[PDB]
């Protein structure tokens, strides 16, 4: 589970209305909740086991080799998302499996400015203000709000590998 | 609104079997997961089996298991309870619930919201 | 399967007071799956709280929800007659509790 203390492997952490999760950076993805790696464009005998997407691992078939996504997610349109999210739409944000529910469940994570509407199916419509609990610790950087999602970034003064 | 009614209930001997049912309307079924609640005759509230919303994870009770079978069927939005051999225990009103959410305070706090009415079995020869 | 032990069994009190229903579970369970219930007899059951404190839609602010851990208790100020009823805790995909009653005191 992605708290505020994770270090996201060659990724950087944003925050939704509900959860927190690692972005990638540039064309890398997701091996797992914390971690970021190459994508391999074609599997085979040599990158057997290697990330080729989010949450998607190169498996042997006995002699061809595949992308598969990891156990509990389904491909839509070429990316890998939980199973529970299927069927689940949230407007202003995505579907998250919440992994400490006893039972596999869907919730809506909306973005900053929403927050699940229990009369409109839990979906993410209804005004909510989500405080950012991103530590930004890096030199003069700040938790700024971009493209409805939170994330640290430069100050008000400082730009672009450190903030200057 | 929201509305589930259940159906299936009634007479049966000892060691037969029955299929209840519950109709849901008024809200998208398959995002929510359903559960069963039975209460014998002056007795409690005992959960019996709940399923997710695409219903490929089934849980059940410890009373319940191996005669009984939940099962969902997303497109006539209907919960079902499956059940054979029928012990004189399972005497009960049986109650659908919708699972949901209710995002309190930076927490997702969950609870069973809407019910049914409940349909009577009752087990004796 | 855990076991969520309620108290008291049967708990007597007049309409204007407070009432405290506990729920003990067997283990340690998340807040957030923790819920009570309210049932009138002849009636179908009614979520009071989702999660272990967040108030369901319709229910009186006099009903009050804490607890953590293994402890949670449902407190009911300032009573009135159509609180009297019996009430259930229940952990989320889980077991009931026993089930606490509350009873008019005359």
């Known amino acids: 589970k992605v708290t505020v203390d994770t270090v996201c492997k060659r990724g950087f952490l944003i925050q939704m209305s509900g959860h927190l999760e690692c972005k990638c950076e540039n064309d890398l993805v997701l091996v797992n909740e914390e971690t970021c790696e190459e994508k391999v464009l074609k599997c085979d005998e040599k990158t057997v086991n290697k990330p080729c997407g989010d949450f998607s691992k190169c498996i042997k078939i006995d002699v061809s080799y595949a992308c598969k996504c990891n156990l509990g997610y389904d491909m839509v349109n070429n990316v890998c998302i939980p199973n529970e999210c299927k069927q689940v739409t949230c407007g202003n944000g995505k579907c998250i499996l919440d992994t400490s529910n006893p039972v596999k469940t869907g919730v809506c994570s909306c973005n900053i400015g929403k927050v699940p509407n229990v009369q409109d199916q839990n979906k993410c419509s209804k005004d909510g203000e989500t405080k950012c609990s991103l530590k930004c610790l890096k030199e003069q950087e700040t938790c700024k709000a971009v493209d409805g999602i939170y994330k640290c970034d430069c100050k008000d003064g400082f730009i672009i590998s450190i903030c200057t | 609104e929201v509305q589930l009614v259940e159906s299936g209930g009634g007479l049966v001997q000892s060691g037969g079997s029955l299929r209840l049912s519950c109709a849901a309307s008024?809200?998208?079924?398959?995002?929510?997961?359903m559960n069963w609640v039975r209460q014998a005759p002056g007795k409690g509230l005992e959960w019996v089996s709940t399923?997710?919303?695409?219903?490929?994870?089934?849980y059940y009770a410890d009373s319940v298991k191996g005669r009984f079978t939940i099962s969902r069927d997303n497109s006539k939005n209907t919960l079902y309870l499956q059940v054979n051999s029928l012990r004189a225990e399972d005497t009960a009103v049986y109650y659908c619930?919708?699972?949901?959410?209710?995002?309190?305070?930076?927490?997702?706090?969950?609870?069973?919201?809407?019910w049914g009415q409940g349909t009577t079995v009752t087990v004796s020869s | 399967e855990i076991v969520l032990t309620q108290s008291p069994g049967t708990l007597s009190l007049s309409p204007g007071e407070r009432a405290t229903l506990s729920c003990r579970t067997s283990?340690?369970?998340?807040?957030?799956?923790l819920a009570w219930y309210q049932q009138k007899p002849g009636q179908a059951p009614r979520l009071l709280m989702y999660?272990?404190?967040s108030r369901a839609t319709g229910i009186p602010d006099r009903f009050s929800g804490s607890g953590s851990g293994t402890d949670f208790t449902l407190t009911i100020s300032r009573l009135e007659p159509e609180d009297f009823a019996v009430y259930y805790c229940?952990?989320?995909?889980?077991?009931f509790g026993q089930g606490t009653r509350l009873e008019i005191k005359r």
């Open positions: 619930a919708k699972g949901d959410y209710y995002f309190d305070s930076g927490s997702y706090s969950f609870g069973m919201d809407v």
């Open positions: 008024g809200f998208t079924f398959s995002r929510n997961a």
């Open positions: 399923i997710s919303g695409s219903g490929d994870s089934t």
């Open positions: 283990q340690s369970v998340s807040s957030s799956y």
């Open positions: 999660g272990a404190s």
């Open positions: 229940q952990q989320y995909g889980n077991s």
